[PDB]
Amino acid sequence: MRKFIIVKNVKVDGINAKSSDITVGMPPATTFCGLGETMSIKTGIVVKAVSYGSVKFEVRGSRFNTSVTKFAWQDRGNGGKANNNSPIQPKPLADGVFTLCFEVEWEDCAEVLVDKVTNFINTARIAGGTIASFNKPFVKVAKDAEELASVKNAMMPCYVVVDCGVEVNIFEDAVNRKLQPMVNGYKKLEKIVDNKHMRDKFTPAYLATPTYTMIGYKMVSNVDNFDQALWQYGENTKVKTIGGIY
């Protein structure tokens, strides 16, 4: 018996927009699907799928150039090189109002799930962002598509994200169809021989390259299937959709 928990109108601030060197703005679906593993490890509630919209979104900067804060001098080897401003490499940030849906199985009363996601919101960060204000979470129960439409009518207004798929490759598809790409998976390239520079020192580490896909921004009152809008872990080191390609 599946359960849905909803984070509505969460104000994210300081979220770095650089999903890749070629996609900037929204963080990839790896971020919001790893949020589920973050509450699966930090809290313990098993999250199987995730979906997200956007009440508002804006990347910090002007119309053709969005850009980056003056960097600090937080490196060793720059002793006399501190009076100058910074070495500045691009890292644009954003701010947005989001809606989040998590697929969880609880097998317990709903008065614990709300507090157990509330105290996790206050300690986690949304891709480097800072939560300012967020509505109180509530638990939704749906057993069919008719009761899943009750979940559909309550996110009004938002702009949800559905998969769209690539025709041949990235920028060609971005041109002729005028759609939006974003990263949906990672391809292993080479294994680092030494683990003394890792943050875990036990798990083997491989270099990765971002694999992209096309999506669609849709009105939440006009989507046929929510499972077309949910996202989850895939294979290998990829994400996908329950409902497949729209």
């Binding site: 601030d13 002007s62 053709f64 850009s67 804060t69 003056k70 001098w73 720059n78 501190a82 009076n83």
Partner: protein, 102 residues
């Protein structure tokens, strides 16, 4: 009314100091919603944060939320960060930087 340059002890601020020092000493979270009110004058000029941009149309651009004036969050965090009066020949508080350079 508080003096920004000089850190003066008073009883109203020490309770917030202890209530965030308890979270700082151990583990947890504490969130404070802060509002500021200023009598500036009838139709005065305000100063939001300016963006880092080489914008071809706007020379000096102020930060916006769909047109509403707004500051940067790290602009705020720089001022909360600004505590350092422990460097040599200290006269004014500066931001916490590992080389003590603003």
């Amino acid at each position: 009314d508080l003096l920004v340059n000089e850190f003066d002890e008073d009883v109203d601020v020490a309770e917030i100091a202890d209530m965030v020092a308890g979270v700082l000493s151990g583990e947890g979270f504490v969130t404070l919603k802060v509002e500021h009110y200023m009598l500036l004058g009838e139709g005065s000029e305000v100063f939001p944060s300016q963006e880092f941009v080489e914008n071809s149309k706007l020379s000096k651009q102020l930060f916006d939320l769909n047109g509403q004036a707004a500051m940067h969050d790290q602009k705020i965090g720089n001022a909360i960060r600004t505590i350092d009066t422990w460097y040599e020949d200290a006269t004014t508080p500066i931001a916490v930087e590992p080389y003590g350079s603003v």
